[PDB]
Amino acid sequence: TGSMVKSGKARAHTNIALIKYWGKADETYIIPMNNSLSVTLDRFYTETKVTFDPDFTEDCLILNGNEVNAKEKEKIQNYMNIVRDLAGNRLHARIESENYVPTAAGLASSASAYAALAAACNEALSLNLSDTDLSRLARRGSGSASRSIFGGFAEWEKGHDDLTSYAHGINSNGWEKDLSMIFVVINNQSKKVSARSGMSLTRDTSRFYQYWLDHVDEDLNEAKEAVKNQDFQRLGEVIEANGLRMHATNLGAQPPFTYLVQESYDAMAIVEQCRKANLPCYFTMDAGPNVKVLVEKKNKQAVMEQFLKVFDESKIIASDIISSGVEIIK
């Protein structure tokens, strides 16, 4: 690289919330209405290189080898303004990013993408940010990204302002190394839906939103204690119920909506069948019909074969849970 050129490249992994983030207290800084708890996936990640050069006049984003539209371009530039303000400089960057996440299959990439960008900028500009400040910076891009700074179990503390809302990793005595998540890729419409817009309609008009608020802290504690004890059934039951409560809130929105399709319900049924046949596992769903199945690694295969009795081989994708957090790479 050139003499006056500052570059950094980072790899960050996606995460799935077991206790859901859903609805914001503050829409501009992305402060959430409640804490969330997630696990960071080994298989799925984003790699992002950022290159700061004084001769650059504006930010450029290249995604999987392709230019992005003026819209995405405008968005990334506003995000980099935050970075520039944080760093006290006026350098623009060329950003080259590669998603190793099944996005076509409906897996979200925003958590890994913003965590990767935050880390790469910190590396490029030698900002020396703490994990806490990295999380805070990622959060500004996407709420769930705040958690992808960390490996294993992580929790996003909601705080009350930009300084206090951020994530931290939970030590679980290496329990994360025993667990896995199976993704059931569900046939969906290819229409353009959005978590940010969905949770906003819900958080604002849901007749069942209060019900969600009145239970989430209890769920959070229950889950955290289940983790302290490596009690899989205890964790599973509460996260499965939390997730369903989240989708319940959408049904109460004005007017109602759902991310779930009949096939999501079919996969749910198979999970309950696996349990009754002494194969512990629990499901959760995000802003779409895909069903994610939490399972102890020893039972991963056995559970998968049950899904493989009905779903296409290509639609059953398993990932382990990675122990380590965001990393700087070449």
Ligand SMILES: O=C(O)[C@@H]1CCCN1C(=O)COP(=O)(O)OP(=O)(O)O
């Ligand atoms: O992952 C989450 O914690 C929640 C729970 C269910 C799925 N989900 C989401 O899709 C959150 O998607 P985000 O891209 O982080 O939303 P923004 O903060 O507006 O950027």
